[PDB]
Amino acid sequence: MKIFLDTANIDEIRTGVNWGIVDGVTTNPALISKEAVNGKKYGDIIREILKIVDGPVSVEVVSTKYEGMVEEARKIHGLGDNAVVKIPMTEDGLRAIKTLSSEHINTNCTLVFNPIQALLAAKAGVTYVSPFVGRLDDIGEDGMQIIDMIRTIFNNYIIKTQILVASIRNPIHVLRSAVIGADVVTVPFNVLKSLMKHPKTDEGLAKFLEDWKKVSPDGKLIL
Amino acid sequence: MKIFLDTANIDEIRTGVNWGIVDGVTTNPALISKEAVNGKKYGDIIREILKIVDGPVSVEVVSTKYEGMVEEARKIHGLGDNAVVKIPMTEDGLRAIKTLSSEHINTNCTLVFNPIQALLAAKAGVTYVSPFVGRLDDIGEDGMQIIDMIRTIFNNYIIKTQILVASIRNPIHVLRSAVIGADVVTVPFNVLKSLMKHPKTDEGLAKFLEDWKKVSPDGKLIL
Amino acid sequence: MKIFLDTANIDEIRTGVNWGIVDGVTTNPALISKEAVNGKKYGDIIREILKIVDGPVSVEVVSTKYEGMVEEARKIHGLGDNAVVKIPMTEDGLRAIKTLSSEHINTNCTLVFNPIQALLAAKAGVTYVSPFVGRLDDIGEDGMQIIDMIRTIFNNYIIKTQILVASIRNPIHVLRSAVIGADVVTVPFNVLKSLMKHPKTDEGLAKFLEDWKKVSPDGKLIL
Amino acid sequence: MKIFLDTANIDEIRTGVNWGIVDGVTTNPALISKEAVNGKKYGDIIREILKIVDGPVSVEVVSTKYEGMVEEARKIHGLGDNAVVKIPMTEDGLRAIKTLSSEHINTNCTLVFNPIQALLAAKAGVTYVSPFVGRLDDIGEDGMQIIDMIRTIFNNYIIKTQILVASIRNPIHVLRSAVIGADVVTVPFNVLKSLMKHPKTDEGLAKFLEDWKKVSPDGKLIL
Amino acid sequence: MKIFLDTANIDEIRTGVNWGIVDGVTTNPALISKEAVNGKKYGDIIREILKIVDGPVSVEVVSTKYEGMVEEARKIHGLGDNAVVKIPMTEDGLRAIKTLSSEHINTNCTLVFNPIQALLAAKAGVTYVSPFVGRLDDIGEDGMQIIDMIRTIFNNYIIKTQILVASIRNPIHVLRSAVIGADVVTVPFNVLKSLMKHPKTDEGLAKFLEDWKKVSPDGKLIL
Amino acid sequence: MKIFLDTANIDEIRTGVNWGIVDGVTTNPALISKEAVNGKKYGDIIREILKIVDGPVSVEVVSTKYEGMVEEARKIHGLGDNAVVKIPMTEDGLRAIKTLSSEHINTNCTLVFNPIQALLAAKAGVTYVSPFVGRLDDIGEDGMQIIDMIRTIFNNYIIKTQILVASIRNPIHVLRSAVIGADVVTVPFNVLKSLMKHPKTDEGLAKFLEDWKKVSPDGKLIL
Amino acid sequence: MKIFLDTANIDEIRTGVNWGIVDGVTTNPALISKEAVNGKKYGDIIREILKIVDGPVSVEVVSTKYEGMVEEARKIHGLGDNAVVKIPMTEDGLRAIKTLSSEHINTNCTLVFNPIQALLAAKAGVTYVSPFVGRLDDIGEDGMQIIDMIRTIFNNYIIKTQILVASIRNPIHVLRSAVIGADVVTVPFNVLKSLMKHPKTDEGLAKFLEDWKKVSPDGKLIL
Amino acid sequence: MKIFLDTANIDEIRTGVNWGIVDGVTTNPALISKEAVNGKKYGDIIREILKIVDGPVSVEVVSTKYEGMVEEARKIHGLGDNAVVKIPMTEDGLRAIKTLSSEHINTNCTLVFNPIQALLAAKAGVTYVSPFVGRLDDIGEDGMQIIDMIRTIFNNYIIKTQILVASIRNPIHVLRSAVIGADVVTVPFNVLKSLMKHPKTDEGLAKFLEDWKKVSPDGKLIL
Ligand SMILES: *[C@@H](CO)[C@@H](O)[C@H](O)[C@H](O)COP(=O)(O)O
Ligand SMILES: *[C@@H](CO)[C@@H](O)[C@H](O)[C@H](O)COP(=O)(O)O
Ligand SMILES: *[C@@H](CO)[C@@H](O)[C@H](O)[C@H](O)COP(=O)(O)O
Ligand SMILES: *[C@@H](CO)[C@@H](O)[C@H](O)[C@H](O)COP(=O)(O)O
Ligand SMILES: *[C@@H](CO)[C@@H](O)[C@H](O)[C@H](O)COP(=O)(O)O
Ligand SMILES: *[C@@H](CO)[C@@H](O)[C@H](O)[C@H](O)COP(=O)(O)O
Ligand SMILES: *[C@@H](CO)[C@@H](O)[C@H](O)[C@H](O)COP(=O)(O)O
Ligand SMILES: *[C@@H](CO)[C@@H](O)[C@H](O)[C@H](O)COP(=O)(O)O
């Protein structure tokens, strides 16, 4: 399972990549506008992320019309080969995905909330589909159930579109995604950081360190 | 999963084709007779759909006897290579399917209501079998259970006939067909258009464009 | 399980009542406005339905504010003892239900789309809660799964609010509701009419008539 | 589980009643007309069965209209207190059932092929409902599944209508009805007699009989 | 769960009665004829078992005709109040069971090999029904599945007939009968003795013995 | 299922109670110190919450030693009859719960992370036990599974301690708690507010309002 | 679920009693012989535990013959009304249990390794039966499966013998016993103390007291 | 499944290796410091184990910083080709694993307590990942459930990191690991010794020896 960082915060992206545990980044217009404050331009932020991340970087078009979407998508693609064009699940979005796929531009269909939407995006040739589990949780349905059904549907038809679980809120979204077999999760930094941690890891490390002081006073392993 | 449009209405077909999510069309004598009013003739309707749709186009014979069905099927085949001959599940229909299969004329066995009917159609060599889920629902049995059994039976014997789910009434027939693994669904236009839609997609799109207005006055993505 | 008729059409209600299989009626503002055209007034439609139907008749308030809802609910209550006040699942609607319940005015909480909303309505003391299965089917979620969860939740806490399955589109919504154990279904007239019918009932009746003609050419039973 | 005999053949009924395992009888127009030959009249056949069978005896109306059904029902009732009036699942039949039940005349609703039909018959007050399992088997659906659903539905609502499994063709219909918990099965005579039999019973009897000739030559148990 | 001994050997019964774990006895013509050798008469054997065993003692008739079975059953009854008359699952056997039940003579229907035979014996009023699990195992059918189905059936109808698992061959027949909830098992003596034993029991005692030798060489518990 | 608000924010508590959907409040030392800023005293905050909430108000002791806990608990209890003393799952906490239970002071055992801790608290007589699902989610285990096991354990032993699900982060914790059958959930305000809402409720209300304008221009229900 | 301490060590018993979570004690000749060193005698140990523990205190006989066991059991009973006589699963042990049960001396059958042994002990009238889960684990079978079967068997027959899970090695034996519904677990002291503990309890407690220092310098709760 | 020995005790390792059932060894700082007492040095213990064991030997770094870990890991690697570097699940440990993996130095990520940590370690390229089942049992969570999830996750993504079950306490951890399909278990010596043994193996051997003595008083097989 690949793990993407769901942020436009450059410092978070740097730190996450410096852990070697981040395989790419997803952004969206909200996450970008959060960071485009106090003189920082959205265009510089996008170029900087594309520079520092070796893996895919998902960047969302803002136009709602087919022509504007394909035009913006070609510009996004021109910024670097790791750019992935994020495109909403709409009638025009699907048309744009089909055209862009034929042009060998990688695409990520976003704002997906049920398995049939996901299937339609795959039929259009989309590289990744992003169902939003947290926003489903918000409306009182277990979002992970939609991930499970997409995985089954994609398995049934040997679909090559990757399932990119998005709107992740907690480490159990991540655990359930991995057990289901989703291709990718995208996580906020706070969630990313918690995935490495466990209280018994902390405790066991402290105890081993104390045990070793009985045999080596300076805490080193001299071999 | 392939998605066909279940209509003889030219504008619905034109619209759904232009969306890029319609892989074919199914018709029947009722659908065609609805469009053959105020001047239009059934031959023009059939020829016009064949022209618009690159994928399979299923057209039903009207004869009930073997010889009439085979003669009408050859005339339907003559209209274009993408024509598929729809034939009812009857003794004469099965004989016709076996004859036409040997002539390499694609066939679609219709009016199928249980799994063993579907198996018999497959044994006669039919290209597609169309179980009617909505008409089973109407009589108080969950029509999707028949799709699940047909899928298992066809998997057991490596059967190459495609399951074409028909008499579809709502987007859950479509969801459950995909989870089962049916090869094709054919859907009325009203159903097809709903498949792309979800209120959270609409809410999330409107919110993203509002966020973007905080960094781009004219709502543009300049890169 | 009670079966209500989901219409404001007086001819449909008269017919279903005469069949003896209609235990009540649900209306909403869409249904009522469909009938109050070309002269007929909405207050007259409501009153005629109250007169015809011996069972509960659900009539929805139009105000969105607590004070207006309660005022409208009292005028609804005053039209006849079988009137039930239909109230939307909103903050003001919950407050209205709590007040009307304390006044021994029967209430029906509507526009419910997940099990926790249904629980909230039951906690406000609502007489009936109406989850909309067909509108969930429309957005790609199996609406009956919400009914199943509500039944389990209500069973857990011995809740007395009745589950009134609404937005019903087909006889399998009805079948599954009964298997789950929902208290009420409300159905449109074309669904109601299908519930009695089965092709093997029709076929068996015809056959038994022919059998009887052998021992009695007139077709009567003389005992 | 009560066990009824599904026949109008007086020799079969006598033979089966003579065994102590027959709790009642069901007839229908076909079963009666098969026996009403060679100067034998349907009225005598019915009266004879009523006299010989302590338990319920189900006798089917032939009128298809409400008023004719109620009039035939009362005449059937007048033939004996054990008579039960068999009435088809139609709009007129439901109306007739509701009238007869209020007159304390026992009823049996027949020609039932799905669970919601069975529920409607129970809601009209019918004493017994008879789903036809064999005729469902004939059309490619496992009829016993319908019994299972009706049992669950009736349990959910504490329904007092007895489930009378009809159109029984083999002893596995009977076994499955008992495991489900149906209240009654009605069986043809050939099925009835097979229910007592098993090859290991026969083989065991013969061995014990031979084992006993070792200790007692004449085959007696002198105590 | 009650536990009976399945034998006619007086020494086995005497030994098992000494243990306090045998609740009754079953015999059959094969078992009785094995002990009636070298001048021991079957009449003596039956009387001595009745005297030794406080609980039910099952003794099988030898006639196959109704009158003879009822006559023999009455002689058996007269031998002691704890006598239970064992009667085969046949047409005359069901008739005899019904007659004897009405005479308040306890009965045990034997040579039962499926659940419907067990149901029929229960409907005749039988006190105990004895399905033969070992003989089903012999013919390649898991005999315990029949016990499971009988338990479910008897539970569905609140049947008072006790399930007496017979033809037991090993301790797992016993374990599974207890997990199912059968009322009684009857076991051969070699099975009965095995039920108390387990190698970890034997090992644990020896070790506790050795431990106590450290504290008290005497081997006593002076309190 | 009772719903508590998990906050010490007086404005949130006022608003939640003014919806009639809040059955009590839980606090802890963190939530209280959040509000005890800029001249507001912790003691006034606790008294104010106890004043405005009619249901239970859980207030946590700060002492870690048994004597300090029982002393603080008696002071908390003295502030009002709705006060519940929140006590951590420690050796001294359990001793304090036992003493306080005998004094008829209601208690809430907090910081519970597995089902056996919950059982020990119930054995001590605790009124409520609070397992922390969100903090389990944080460490990579599905916290709701612990709620499920506690419910089963409590069911097994007819335990009267109420399960109070705490550390709730999202509406699916709430839905799963209700399906499991937990006695109480305690939720932050943001979660509380989301429980009432659904996009289809919003949409349906807007549509009904527009439909009614065709029949009543001023949007009122004049009866 | 009752929790007993499985030890003869006086200080462990004293400590666990003072915690309020120990409902009784089990001993065996090995546990006692461990404490009967450096002067202390087994009689003083047994008498001293009986004094400290209000609940049941199980004390094992050392004789292997019926008469010795019954005599030792009467002497154990004489030591206090809370004494329970532990007797192995052997033929003489079962006889002793039956005799002692009639004398109203409470008993505990030990060295039980499968469900049928437990059933036999229950049929002899034993107060508690102790299956050894840890010693089953040692030989490669999951000992908790035996507890689950015993629970089902005892439920089937409304058996009043309490299941006392023994040879417990870890807190998951305890968890699974509670989920199954065993009546009692007996645990070594090391296991008992771990049952109250969890790292997140420790982390959360330390964090709460840190938060409170921001509003109360001396860490006190003044109300 | 490979079986490693989890000890630094050279006498235990020698013994297990001589049995032929030990495929490798795991150590940690606690285990090593237990043996390096009263003269013996830690560097000598490690070297002797590397010499004795032909299979993998896991030796844990003591530094907590990336640079120190890699330096220590290289000195460990240099001691022999069978050395595996054990590295804790921390941010610096993941970085170290990634670096060492690129240097073709085999690694073992330790102190893993949930499936997502195990996934992270596999993504860093670790040779073996060691979840601690016994430490999870200690805190009241069934540690084997984490092994089951890791196996499923690893199967989903065709991950080549081997699952090395650690913190093993009993032979049922071993049994369940094999049923799940874990790649390796590492066991303490007292667990290892039990894996070969079963009381029925011992009993059957004794019996077969007695049987042979009948046909051969010396006890040999002369062929
Ligand atoms: C792009 C899709 O892969 C992502 O940035 C998604 O927009 C977010 O993951 C959605 O998350 P929120 O629901 O928190 O906006
Ligand atoms: C041909 C078979 O695929 C289709 O046109 C079918 O006739 C329809 O799908 C049947 O649907 P209705 O039950 O709505 O006629
Ligand atoms: C009132 C009970 O809430 C009913 O009239 C419901 O409004 C309808 O059943 C909703 O159905 P539609 O989704 O077809 O409007
Ligand atoms: C009356 C209803 O219980 C019965 O006589 C039914 O008509 C028959 O059981 C129907 O059986 P067939 O399918 O064999 O007519
Ligand atoms: C009487 C009925 O309970 C019993 O004695 C049975 O005949 C035997 O249990 C049958 O056993 P076999 O199959 O071993 O004869
Ligand atoms: C008291 C226990 O019922 C509550 O206030 C709990 O402390 C909180 O619910 C714990 O939640 P957090 O994990 O967010 O502190
Ligand atoms: C008596 C029966 O409850 C207990 O003392 C048992 O002897 C022990 O629980 C057995 O445990 P070990 O297997 O550790 O001896
Ligand atoms: C190394 C593999 O990670 C092993 O030595 C582990 O540290 C131990 O198996 C952990 O066991 P304990 O929980 O008994 O220390």
Q: How far apart are CA H31 and CA H166, in angstroms?
A: 13
Q: How far apart are CA G36 and CA C153, in angstroms?
A: 57
Q: How far apart are CA B136 and CA D136, in angstroms?
A: 13
Pocket of ligand 2, beta carbon within 6 A: B 6, 26-28, 58, 86, 108, 110, 130, 132, 134-135, 164, 166-167, 186
Contact between F3 and C123 using a beta-carbon 8 Å cutoff: yes
- List CB contacts (< 8 A) between G215 and chain F: 32-33, 36, 42
Q: How far apart are CA B152 and CA B160, in angstroms?
A: 13
Contact H33, A215 (CB under 8 A): yes
Q: If you search the block for the tokens 């998990």, which residue do you land on?
A: F6
- List CB contacts (< 8 A) between H199 and chain E: 199-200, 203
Contact between H139 and F114 using a beta-carbon 8 Å cutoff: yes
Contact H146, A172 (CB under 8 A): no
Which chains pack against F, by 3+ Cβ pairs within 8 A?
A, B, C, G, H
> Residue E134 Cα, ligand 5 centroid: separation in angstroms?
9
Continuous H helices in chain B: 10-18, 29-35, 42-52, 66-77, 91-102, 115-123, 133-138, 143-156, 171-180, 189-195, 199-212
Q: What is the experimental method?
A: X-ray
> Residue B174 Cα, ligand 1 centroid: separation in angstroms?
26
| E126 burial type by CB count under 10 A (0-12 exposed, 13-18 middle, 19+ buried) | buried
Domain boundaries, chain A: 1-223
* E214 reaches H (C-beta below 8 A): no
Ligand 7 neighbour G110 (Cβ under 6 A): yes
Ligand showing the shortest atom-to-Cα distance for residue G84:
7
Work out whether strand H107-112 and strand H128-131 pair parallel, antiparallel, or are unpaired.
Answer: parallel
Q: How far apart are CA F178 and CA F43, in angstroms?
A: 34
Residue-wise burial string across H88-117, b where 16 or more C-beta atoms lie within 10 A, e elsewhere: bbbbbbbbbbbbbeeeebbbbbbbbbbbbb
* B67: nearest Cα among B109, B96, B110, B94: B96
Q: If you search the block for the tokens 């410091």, which residue do you land on?
A: H33
Contact between D139 and B114 using a beta-carbon 8 Å cutoff: yes
Instruction: Give Cα separations from E86 to E61, E122, H207 (angstroms).
Output: 6, 14, 41
Q: If you search the block for the tokens 């209509």, which residue do you land on?
A: B7
> Residue B207 Cα, ligand 6 centroid: separation in angstroms?
32
Catalytic residue among D41, D86, D123, D213: D86
Contact between G221 and F139 using a beta-carbon 8 Å cutoff: no
Contact G222, F107 (CB under 8 A): no
Continuous H helices in chain G: 10-18, 29-35, 42-52, 66-77, 91-102, 115-123, 133-138, 143-156, 171-180, 189-195, 199-212
| DSSP per-residue codes, H89-103 | SSHHHHHHHHHHHHT
Phi and psi at residue D12, to the nearest 5°: -65, -45
Contact between H200 and E200 using a beta-carbon 8 Å cutoff: no
Instruction: Give Cα separations from C36 to C9, C40, E116, F20, F54 (angstroms).
Output: 10, 5, 62, 36, 47
Question: Which C-chain residues 53-72 have CB contacts (< 8 A) with chain B?
Answer: none
> Residue G205 Cα, ligand 5 centroid: separation in angstroms?
66
* F61: nearest Cα among F16, F95, F96: F96
Q: If you search the block for the tokens 């410092």, which residue do you land on?
A: A11
* G221: nearest Cα among F89, F8, F86, F51: F86
Closest residue in chain A to residue B219, using alpha carbons only? A62
| DSSP per-residue codes, G36-61 | S-TT--HHHHHHHHHHH-SS-EEEE-
Work out whether strand A107-112 and strand A128-131 pair parallel, antiparallel, or are unpaired.
Answer: parallel
| Count of helix runs (H) and strand runs (E) in chain A | 11, 8
Q: Going along chain F, which residue ranges are E strands?
A: 2-6, 24-26, 57-60, 83-88, 107-112, 128-131, 162-165, 184-187
Q: How far apart are CA B151 and CA B164, in angstroms?
A: 11
- Tell me which amino acid residue B15 is: T
Q: What is the token pair recorded at C42? A: 């909405």
Question: Which C-chain residues 143-202 have CB contacts (< 8 A) with chain D?
Answer: 171, 174-175, 178-181, 195-196, 198, 200-201
* G128: nearest Cα among G146, G112, G145: G112
Distance from CA of B25 to the nearest CA of D (A): 29
Q: How far apart are CA A21 and CA A2, in angstroms?
A: 9
| Adjacent-strand bridge partners of G58 | G26, G84
- List CB contacts (< 8 A) between H33 and chain A: 211-212, 214-215
Q: How far apart are CA G221 and CA F87, in angstroms?
A: 13
The sign one gets for the Cα dihedral H174, H178, H182, H185 is positive
Work out whether strand D107-112 and strand D128-131 pair parallel, antiparallel, or are unpaired.
Answer: parallel
Ligand 3 neighbour C187 (Cβ under 6 A): no
Neighbour tally for A178: CB within 10 Å: 24
| F176 burial type by CB count under 10 A (0-12 exposed, 13-18 middle, 19+ buried) | buried
Q: Tell me which residue has its CA closest to atom 14 in ligand 3.
A: C167
List all residues 6 or more positions away from C134 whose beta carbon is below 8 Å from its beta carbon: B170, C143, C167, C168, C169, C173
Q: How far apart are CA B52 and CA B127, in angstroms?
A: 22
Q: How far apart are CA G103 and CA G98, in angstroms?
A: 9
Contact between F117 and H139 using a beta-carbon 8 Å cutoff: no
Q: How far apart are CA F10 and CA F2, in angstroms?
A: 20
Rg (chain G; Cα; Å): 20
* A39 reaches G (C-beta below 8 A): no
Total number of residues shown for chain D: 223
Neighbour tally for A12: CB within 10 Å: 20
- Tell me which amino acid residue E213 is: K
Pocket of ligand 1, beta carbon within 6 A: A 6, 26-28, 31, 58, 86, 108, 110, 130, 132, 134-135, 164, 166-167, 186
Contact F88, F62 (CB under 8 A): no
Contact A66, A55 (CB under 8 A): no
The sign one gets for the Cα dihedral F202, F204, F205, F210 is positive
Neighbour tally for C171: CB within 10 Å: 23
Q: If you search the block for the tokens 């030798």, which residue do you land on?
A: E213
Note whether D touches A: 3 CB pairs or more under 8 A: no
Residue-wise burial string across A179-190, b where 16 or more C-beta atoms lie within 10 A, e elsewhere: bbbbbbbbbbbe
| B38 burial type by CB count under 10 A (0-12 exposed, 13-18 middle, 19+ buried) | exposed
Ligand 3 neighbour C167 (Cβ under 6 A): yes
* G116 reaches F (C-beta below 8 A): no
Contact C132, C156 (CB under 8 A): no
* G125 reaches H (C-beta below 8 A): no
DSSP tag of G183? S
* C112 reaches F (C-beta below 8 A): yes
Contact F88, F75 (CB under 8 A): no
Closest residue in chain E to residue G148, using alpha carbons only? E179
Ligand 7 neighbour G166 (Cβ under 6 A): yes
* D207 reaches E (C-beta below 8 A): yes
* G12: nearest Cα among G186, G193, G166: G193
> Residue F150 Cα, ligand 6 centroid: separation in angstroms?
18
The gap between the terminal CA atoms of chain G, to the nearest Å, is 37
> Residue A24 Cα, ligand 1 centroid: separation in angstroms?
14
Q: Going along chain H, which residue ranges are E strands?
A: 2-6, 24-26, 57-60, 83-88, 107-112, 128-131, 162-165, 184-187
| Adjacent-strand bridge partners of G13 | none
* F79 reaches G (C-beta below 8 A): yes
Neighbour tally for B160: CB within 10 Å: 11
| DSSP per-residue codes, D82-150 | TEEEEEESSHHHHHHHHHHHHTT--EEEEEE-SHHHHHHHHHTT-SEEEEBHHHHHHTTS-THHHHHHH
Probe ligand 2: pick from B130, B150, B183, max atoms within 8 Å of CB?
Answer: B130
Q: What is the token pair recorded at F177? A: 């708690």
Minimum-distance CB partner of E215 among G36, G91, G153: G36
* A and G: number of Cβ contacts within 8 A: 5
Phi and psi at residue A129, to the nearest 5°: -120, 135
| DSSP per-residue codes, A75-126 | HHHHT-TTEEEEEESSHHHHHHHHHHHHTT--EEEEEE-SHHHHHHHHHTT-
Contact C150, C115 (CB under 8 A): yes
Closest residue in chain F to residue B200, using alpha carbons only? F199
Contact G88, G78 (CB under 8 A): no
Contact A57, A82 (CB under 8 A): yes
Minimum-distance CB partner of A174 among H68, H76, H116: H116
| Adjacent-strand bridge partners of A108 | A86, A128
- Tell me which amino acid residue H182 is: A
Residue-wise burial string across H127-137, b where 16 or more C-beta atoms lie within 10 A, e elsewhere: bbbbbbbbbbb
Instruction: Give Cα separations from G157 to E10, E152, E161, E164, G150 (angstroms).
Output: 30, 15, 15, 15, 11
| DSSP per-residue codes, C19-50 | HT---EEE--HHHHHHHS-TT--HHHHHHHHH
Contact between B142 and C169 using a beta-carbon 8 Å cutoff: no
Work out whether strand G83-88 and strand C162-165 pair parallel, antiparallel, or are unpaired.
Answer: unpaired
Q: How far apart are CA D180 and CA D187, in angstroms?
A: 17
- Tell me which amino acid residue B92 is: D
| B211 burial type by CB count under 10 A (0-12 exposed, 13-18 middle, 19+ buried) | middle
Q: What is the token pair recorded at B180? A: 């089962």
Q: What is the token pair recorded at F91? A: 């050796």
Q: What is the token pair recorded at D84? A: 């039960």
The sign one gets for the Cα dihedral D89, D92, D94, D100 is negative
* B111: nearest Cα among B153, B158, B156, B58: B58
* E167: nearest Cα among E196, E126, E138, E205: E138
Q: If you search the block for the tokens 């590289």, which residue do you land on?
A: A127
Q: Tell me which residue has its CA closest to atom 11 in ligand 5.
A: E167
B159 HSE (CA, 13 A, CB side): 25
List all residues 6 or more positions away from F212 whose beta carbon is below 8 Å from its beta carbon: C29, C33, C62, F219
Q: What 3-state DSSP class applies to E20?
A: coil
- Tell me which amino acid residue G220 is: K
| DSSP per-residue codes, D49-90 | HHHH-SS-EEEE----SHHHHHHHHHHHHHT-TTEEEEEESS
Residue-wise burial string across G93-109, b where 16 or more C-beta atoms lie within 10 A, e elsewhere: bbbbbbbbeeeebbbbb
Pocket of ligand 8, beta carbon within 6 A: H 6, 26-28, 30-31, 58, 86, 108, 110, 130, 132, 134-135, 166-167, 186
> Residue D166 Cα, ligand 4 centroid: separation in angstroms?
5
Q: How far apart are CA H35 and CA H9, in angstroms?
A: 6
Contact between G171 and F72 using a beta-carbon 8 Å cutoff: no
* A116 reaches C (C-beta below 8 A): yes
Distance from CA of E223 to the nearest CA of G (A): 6
Contact between C139 and F174 using a beta-carbon 8 Å cutoff: no
Q: What is the token pair recorded at F102? A: 């005998």
Contact C124, F20 (CB under 8 A): yes
- Indicate if A86 belongs to the active site: yes
